[PDB]
């Protein structure tokens, strides 16, 4: 899948799918 680790909401064409943890920071997981 194509996915992004986001600092804001997911884009409209993306689905919230979990959490990224990179270098200690949390991100929304947004896939399409």
Chain residues in the site for Cl ion (CB under 5 A): 6-8, 21, 24
Q: State how far the Cα of 5 lies from the Cα of 28, in Å rounded to an integer.
A: 6
Residues in the chain: 32
Q: Which does 14 bind (CB under 5 to 8 A by kind): Cl ion, a second copy, none?
A: none
Using CB under 8 A as the binding rule, whether residue 6 contacts a second copy is answered as no
User: Which whole-number Å values give the CA distances from 24 to 9, 11, 18, in the listed order?
Assistant: 19, 23, 16
Residue nearest to Cl ion as judged by C-beta position = 6
Which residue among 6, 10, 14, 27 contacts a second copy (CB under 8 A)? 27
């Amino acid at each position: 899948a194509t996915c992004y680790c986001r600092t804001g909401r997911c884009a409209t064409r993306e689905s919230l799918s979990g959490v990224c943890e990179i270098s200690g920071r949390l991100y929304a997981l947004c896939c399409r």
